[PDB]
């Protein structure tokens, strides 16, 4: 019964409350950053597709944290809402101090530090948010990162969190394109992964959110796709499978 409090050493030496924060993702909305180089993308599926949802958010899983960095979130909605704006506040503070855009890696580490601090102190709870990061910086350019509620982080070429992450990572191993990770090939991967990792059958594109980032015009750009173009992408997936049909 060593999970009864946040700050406890188990006889196994494991902190079961932080492990529970890890388990919390086991029912969160799925979001993936596909294998993308020369560009970078984040995509997600929507739980709340309903006949009366207004969707005036225009983004509820993808969140643009800076003019050239974006994030995708799975976990506690309120902790997500406060952390995604803590991101923007960190960017504003760093821009005010250094007069320079913040690097992606430093941002990831700084925010994971806050998450770790909340995991460390009693009378406090870890932020139940796991999330993926994309952006361009003077250090490396486009990057893809993953971060846990515990404050752990990792750099990735492709990753996915939330529901059905096993299938996503399996096909990422299967459809791996090491080096030739061009963004349009990542969209080709997306066309299939959106229908595959989603537990749905015959996916409707409106339950999907897609965004990307690229140095298209030199000053960096972040793009988000509407319903019609994602429907066209899913149609391209449908015709890919309808020509694989010749051997099904």
């Amino acid at each position: 019964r060593y999970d009864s409090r946040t700050t406890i050493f188990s006889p196994e030496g494991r902190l079961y409350q932080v492990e529970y924060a890890m388990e919390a993702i086991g029912h969160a909305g799925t979001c993936l950053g596909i294998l993308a180089n020369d560009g970078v993308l984040l995509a997600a599926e929507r739980r709340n597709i309903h006949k009366l949802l207004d969707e005036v958010f225009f983004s509820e899983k993808i969140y643009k944290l800076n003019e050239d960095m974006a994030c995708s979130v799975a976990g506690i909605t309120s902790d997500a809402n406060v952390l995604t704006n803590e991101l923007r506040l960190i960017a504003q503070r760093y821009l005010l101090q250094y007069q320079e855009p913040i690097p992606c890696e430093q941002l990831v580490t700084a925010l994971c530090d806050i998450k770790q601090a909340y995991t460390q102190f009693g009378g406090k709870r870890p932020f139940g948010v796991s999330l993926l990061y994309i952006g361009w910086d003077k250090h490396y350019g486009f990057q893809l990162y993953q971060s846990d509620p515990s404050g752990n982080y990792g750099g990735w070429k492709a990753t996915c969190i939330g529901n059905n992450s096993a299938a996503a990572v399996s096909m990422l191993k299967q459809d791996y394109k090491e080096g030739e990770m061009t963004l349009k090939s990542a969209l080709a991967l997306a066309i299939k992964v959106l229908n595959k990792t989603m537990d749905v059958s015959k996916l409707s594109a409106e339950k999907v959110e897609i965004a990307t980032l690229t140095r298209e015009n030199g000053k960096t750009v972040i793009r988000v796709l509407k319903q019609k173009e994602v429907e066209q992408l899913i149609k391209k997936h449908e015709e890919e499978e309808a020509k694989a049909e010749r051997e099904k």
């Binding site: 006889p11 752990n152 791996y176």
Partner: protein, 239 residues
């Protein structure tokens, strides 16, 4: 009393809840460190990058200052927090204070920090042990073990993580009176100690060297094959 809380002694004087730090450290990565004839040499294993993963962000060893770094066995979030404390601490102390920073000073500071976080409720003491190696202590390099309990000590050669079990005997099995000569035998003994790692072939066995005067130098993949081959040839000729 029982292990339900840090701040109370067991009815025999034990601190089981604190003493869980041993297996807290043991389930992390694997690392080894030595001081050579002058140059300290460290090595890490157990990366196991899952294809799309990288070890670049994993950062088992980080150079705090041009004459001090450490190895971070344990949970990675606490390791990164220790990075941000120690690196900035030594940088600011050297940049502002009348005295320079030494590996002994940073080891003292980390020991005091962990002891102080043991000194209160509602504050989880850092669950990582670390080998902290420094090039400058009155100009002389040296090595330190540090533990979550706040205890710290100096070593000639040590191992942390899952490799902390066997190497304690292994070093005593082959440590010569001669401190491992130059960088040749220093790196050779690093490789010998890291041979307890999964395959010892250098496929996921990496290392770095600090020459007691210059900053941390990396045994990068374009060259670490040479040290791996040195270790393999040494183990093959003595068979």
């Amino acid at each position: 009393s029982y292990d339900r809380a840090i701040t109370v002694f067991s009815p025999d004087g034990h601190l089981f809840q604190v003493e869980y730090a041993q297996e807290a450290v043991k389930k992390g990565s694997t690392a080894v460190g030595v001081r050579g004839r002058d140059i300290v040499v460290l090595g890490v294993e157990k990366k196991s990058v899952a294809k799309l993963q990288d070890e670049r962000t994993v950062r088992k060893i980080c150079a705090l200052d041009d004459n001090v770094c450490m190895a971070f066995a344990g949970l990675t979030a606490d390791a990164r927090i220790v990075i941000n404390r120690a690196r900035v601490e030594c940088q600011s102390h050297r940049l502002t204070v009348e005295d320079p920073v030494t590996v002994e000073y940073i080891t003292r500071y980390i020991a005091s920090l962990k002891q102080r976080y043991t000194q209160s409720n509602g504050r989880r003491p850092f669950g990582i042990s670390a080998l902290i190696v420094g090039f400058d202590f009155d100009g002389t390099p040296r090595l330190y073990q540090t533990d979550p309990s706040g205890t710290y000590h100096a070593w000639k050669a040590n191992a942390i993580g899952r490799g902390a079990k066997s190497v304690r005997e292994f070093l005593e099995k082959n440590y010569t009176d001669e401190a491992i000569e130059t960088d040749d035998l220093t790196i050779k003994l690093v490789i010998k100690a890291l041979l307890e790692v999964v395959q010892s072939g250098g496929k996921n066995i990496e290392l770095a060297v600090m020459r007691r005067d210059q900053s941390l130098k990396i045994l990068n993949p374009e060259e670490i094959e040479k040290y791996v081959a040195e270790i393999e040839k040494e183990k093959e000729e003595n068979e």
